[PDB]
Design a protein around this ligand. Structure first.
Ligand SMILES: C[S@](=O)c1ccc(-c2nc(-c3ccc(F)cc3)c(-c3ccncc3)[nH]2)cc1
Ligand SMILES: CCCCCCCCO[C@@H]1O[C@H](CO)[C@@H](O)[C@H](O)[C@H]1O
Ligand SMILES: CCCCCCCCO[C@@H]1O[C@H](CO)[C@@H](O)[C@H](O)[C@H]1O
Length: 337
């Protein structure tokens, strides 16, 4: 049984949606497509509905539409954006051209909730605990976020937090190896970001507000020191090793004299997150077991994902192949409990 759809002009196109979604009100448009807030009469929930723009305009658009859908369908965790619904007005493949995605309405990001204020230690424990819990899940699926920052973090007024992959509402939270276009990366690029987020929550200041790419690097090296010999050993590029070999060696500052007054557990966790050598950074699961999170840690409700086959989305296919693939993802969607 199909729901009854209704047609309505919004953000300069005809939106066509099930009647369960009421009171459509645009929150944003862009090249990606646009979004309305709505009330979902069926669940009683305030929801965001995204209408993809030009989803099947080209191979690249089609490919991306398929990845976005597939990723959304696989993310099922309290601290990660998930899918409430996916729908198309289309009744067959032959007429399939629009894709709408539904999730909880999110009216505020982490910036919007903290507003450059120091938070209490307890409040930072809660926020960070959740980021890390979502990241354990995400990383267990063999995914690296790669651009974790306060704008990619949805936080309601109960400080309940979800990781996003789009700015809801800088380069300051990026791992130094991402800033340096390092060919390889591990999941601890995201742990670096968490450390930057956590420092700023504690202190009320951006940790490394560089004015540009190199000023950013200088600020980082100042806190965490220049590469040691173990780290230099693992540099492939002759130009990167010759650059480093020519730096005046600086020592890693004492984080106790940077985070004056902070809980000593908080300083300890930060020392473990903000190691230059990414092989040396704490992992999410490890950070979740750290004493800093004693009050929130439950080793039995820190769930993992089935690894996520990213090969199916990096194929080189034809428009109408990606579109039928995407159409099957729509048809197969099972609403969550
Ligand atoms: C690339 S651009 O900066 C961009 C901006 C916003 C969004 C954007 N996408 C969504 C959104 C909506 C429904 C979904 F199912 C998935 C994502 C939202 C959203 C979700 C919940 N409440 C408010 C807004 N914002 C996507 C891309
Ligand atoms: C759905 C929210 C879960 C977070 C998973 C985010 C996965 C993001 O994955 C990232 O996407 C970028 C392009 O936007 C790529 O350039 C990066 O290489 C990639 O790591
Ligand atoms: C001058 C500033 C240099 C920044 C040093 C970045 C060190 C990051 O750490 C490196 O991460 C790589 C993945 O990117 C791994 O392959 C390396 O083994 C690891 O040491």
């Amino acid at each position: 049984e199909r729901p009854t759809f209704y047609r309505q002009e919004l953000n300069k196109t005809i939106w066509e949606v099930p009647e369960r979604y009421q009171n459509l009100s645009p929150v944003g448009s862009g090249a990606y497509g646009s979004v309305c807030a709505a009330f979902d009469t069926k669940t009683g929930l305030r929801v965001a509905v995204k209408k993809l723009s030009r989803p099947f305009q080209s191979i690249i658009h089609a490919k991306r539409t398929y990845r976005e859908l597939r990723l959304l369908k696989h993310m099922k965790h309290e601290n990660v954006i998930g899918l409430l619904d996916v729908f198309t007005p289309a009744r067959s493949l032959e007429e399939f051209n629009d894709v709408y995605l539904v999730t909880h309405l999110m009216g505020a990001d982490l910036n919007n909730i903290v507003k450059s204020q120091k938070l209490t230690d307890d409040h930072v424990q809660f926020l960070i605990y959740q980021i890390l819990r979502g990241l354990k899940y995400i990383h267990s699926a063999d995914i690296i976020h790669r651009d974790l920052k306060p704008s990619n973090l949805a936080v309601n007024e109960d400080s309940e937090l979800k990781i996003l992959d789009f700015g809801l509402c800088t380069r300051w939270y990026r791992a130094p190896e991402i800033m340096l276009n390092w060919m390889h990366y591990n999941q601890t690029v995201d742990i670096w970001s968490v450390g930057c987020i956590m420092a700023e929550l504690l202190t009320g200041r951006t940790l490394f507000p560089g004015t540009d790419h190199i000023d950013q690097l200088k600020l980082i090296l100042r806190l965490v020191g220049t590469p040691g010999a173990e780290l230099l050993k693992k540099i492939s590029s002759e130009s990167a090793r010759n650059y480093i070999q020519s730096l005046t060696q600086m020592p890693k500052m004492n984080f106790a004299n940077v985070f004056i007054g902070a809980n000593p557990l908080a300083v300890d966790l930060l020392e473990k997150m903000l190691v230059l050598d990414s092989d040396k950074r704490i992992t999410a699961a490890q950070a979740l077991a750290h004493a800093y999170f004693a009050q929130y840690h439950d080793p039995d409700d820190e769930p993992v994902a089935d690894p996520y086959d990213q090969s199916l989305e990096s194929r080189d296919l034809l428009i109408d192949e990606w579109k039928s693939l995407t159409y099957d993802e729509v048809i197969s969607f099972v609403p969550p409990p």
